[PDB]
């Protein structure tokens, strides 16, 4: 029981796919250095904290994906499964039925060099509402102004204005494990 208004998801034709995606090289820990999306809102009062997301390639070529967040003074863990989709670097969420309200969930790796940075596009439909976000990943907690400007540029090309783009503040708790 609500109302809400969302910037429309871009057509998928506007979201590049990393050429020749290498699933093994993409494994390991990534820090979320940038976040943009139609439900992302810059909040001056209570700024969003950096978290990390860990990709583990399984025998069957799906990823176990684990995100580690610092919240309420504890380390919080969200584990889920990315199942290979229609082309290399594209995934759907495994076990979608087990998430109530969730009808679709798409992941597309837009670009990466595997050992420093990545951008990843996510689109999900939940309670019939269409959310999308772009994540900027670093292998470390810092990235250059140049890379962050590129991420802002790309986010805008998908219809997002600046106040729907945030750069989570680096922290030491939980995510350096
Ligand atoms: O709009 C999006 N994100 C920005 C707002 C995130 N948020 C605020 C943060 C909440 C805190 N958590 C969520 C951590 C726990 N998660 C979940 O138990 C979960 C279960 C099933 C599906 C799913 O998606 N989740 O998250 C993150 O910081 C976190 C970390 C890592 C990955 C991740 O996804 N999240 O959120 C929301 O409440 C929200 C609003 C609307 C849709 C939505 O999916 N979420 O999570 C979005 C668009 C498309 C796919 C997608 O996954 N997301 O999040
Ligand atoms: Cm989410």
Swiss-Prot record:
This is Neutrophil gelatinase-associated lipocalin. The lineage of its organism: Eukaryota, Metazoa, Chordata, Craniata, Vertebrata. Induction: Expression is activated by the oncoprotein BCR-ABL; BCR-ABL misregulates expression via the JAK/STAT pathway and binding of STAT5A to the promoter. Induced by insulin. CDD domains: lipocalin_2-like (cd19457). Belongs to the calycin superfamily. Lipocalin family. It comes from the Eukaryota. The gene is LCN2. Iron-trafficking protein involved in multiple processes such as apoptosis, innate immunity and renal development. Binds iron through association with 2,3-dihydroxybenzoic acid (2,3-DHBA), a siderophore that shares structural similarities with bacterial enterobactin, and delivers or removes iron from the cell, depending on the context. Iron-bound form (holo-24p3) is internalized following binding to the SLC22A17 (24p3R) receptor, leading to release of iron and subsequent increase of intracellular iron concentration. PROSITE patterns: LIPOCALIN.
């Amino acid at each position: 029981d609500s109302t809400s208004d969302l910037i429309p998801a871009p057509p998928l034709s506007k979201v590049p796919l990393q050429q020749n995606f290498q699933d093994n090289q993409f494994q390991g820990k990534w820090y979320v250095v940038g976040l943009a999306g139609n439900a992302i809102l810059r909040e001056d009062k209570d700024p969003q904290k950096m978290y990390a997301t860990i990709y583990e390639l399984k025998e069957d070529k799906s990823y176990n994906v684990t995100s580690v967040l610092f919240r309420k003074k504890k380390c919080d863990y969200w584990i889920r499964t990315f199942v290979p989709g229609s082309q290399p670097g594209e995934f759907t969420l495994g076990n979608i039925k087990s998430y109530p309200g969730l009808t679709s969930y798409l992941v597309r790796v837009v670009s990466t060099n595997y050992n420093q940075h990545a951008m990843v596009f996510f689109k999900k439909v939940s309670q019939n509402r269409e959310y999308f976000k772009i994540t900027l990943y670093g292998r470390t907690k810092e990235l250059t102004s140049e890379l962050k400007e590129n991420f802002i540029r790309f986010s805008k090309s998908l219809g997002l204005p600046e106040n729907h783009i945030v750069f989570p503040v680096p922290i030491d708790q939980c995510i350096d494990g």
